[PDB]
A = this chain, B = another copy of it.
Amino acid sequence: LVNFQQFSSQLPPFVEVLQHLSDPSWTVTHLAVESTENEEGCTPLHLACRKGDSEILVELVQYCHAQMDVTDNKGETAFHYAVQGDNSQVLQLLGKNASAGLNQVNKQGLTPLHLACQMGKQEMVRVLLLCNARCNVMGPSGFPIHTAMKFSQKGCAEMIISMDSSQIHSKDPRYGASPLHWAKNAEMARMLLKRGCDVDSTSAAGNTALHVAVMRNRFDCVMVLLTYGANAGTPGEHGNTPLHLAISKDNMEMIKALIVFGAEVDTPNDFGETPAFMASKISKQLQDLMPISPAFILSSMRDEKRIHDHLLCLDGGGVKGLVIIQLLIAIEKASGVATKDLFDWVAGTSTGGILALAILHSKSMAYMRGVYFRMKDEVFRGSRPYESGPLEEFLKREFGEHTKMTDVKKPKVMLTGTLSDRQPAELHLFRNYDAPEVIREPRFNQNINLKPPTQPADQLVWRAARSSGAAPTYFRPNGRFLDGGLLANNPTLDAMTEIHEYNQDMIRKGQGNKVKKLSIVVSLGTGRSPQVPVTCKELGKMVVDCCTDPDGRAVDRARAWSEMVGIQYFRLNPQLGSDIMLDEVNDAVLVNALWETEVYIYEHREEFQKLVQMLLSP
Contacts and interface: CB of A to CB of B under 8 A. Distances in A.
Interface stretch (A199-207, A340-348, A528-536): A528-536
Contacts of A497: 553, 556-557, 560-561
A421 interface: yes
A185 interface: no
A494 B423 contact: no
Interface stretch (A140-148, A245-253, A446-454): A446-454
Contact of A423 (B453, B501, B533, B557): B533
Given A533-B421, A544-B547, A553 B449 contact: no
A477 B534 CA distance: 13
Contacts of A427: 552-553
Interface stretch (A9-17, A319-327, A485-493): A485-493
Contacts of A452: 533
A408 interface: no
B424 A500 contact: no
Contact of A531 (B450, B473, B493, B545): B450
Determine which residue in A543, A556, A563, A575 has the highest number of CB atoms from chain B within 10 A of its CB, and name it. Answer: A543
Given A487-B546, A553-B427, A449 B561 contact: no
A119 interface: no
Contacts of A528: 443-444
A418 interface: yes
Count copies of this chain in the complex: 2
A539 interface: yes
A423 B531 contact: yes
Contacts of A501: 556, 560
A524 to B, nearest CB: 15
B500 A552 contact: no
A8 interface: no
Interface in A478-513: 482, 486-488, 493-494, 496-497, 500-501, 504
A25 interface: no
A421 B443 CA distance: 38
A231 interface: no
A504 B563 contact: yes
Given A444-B531, A452-B533, A477-B539, A546 B425 contact: yes
A59 interface: no
Nearest to A535: B421
Contacts of A575: 447
A474 to B, nearest CB: 12
A500 B531 CA distance: 27
Contacts of A535: 421
17 contacts: A421-B533, A422-B531, A422-B534, A423-B529, A424-B532, A425-B552, A426-B552, A427-B552, A445-B531, A452-B533, A473-B543, A482-B542, A487-B552, A493-B557, A500-B563, A544-B547, A564-B565
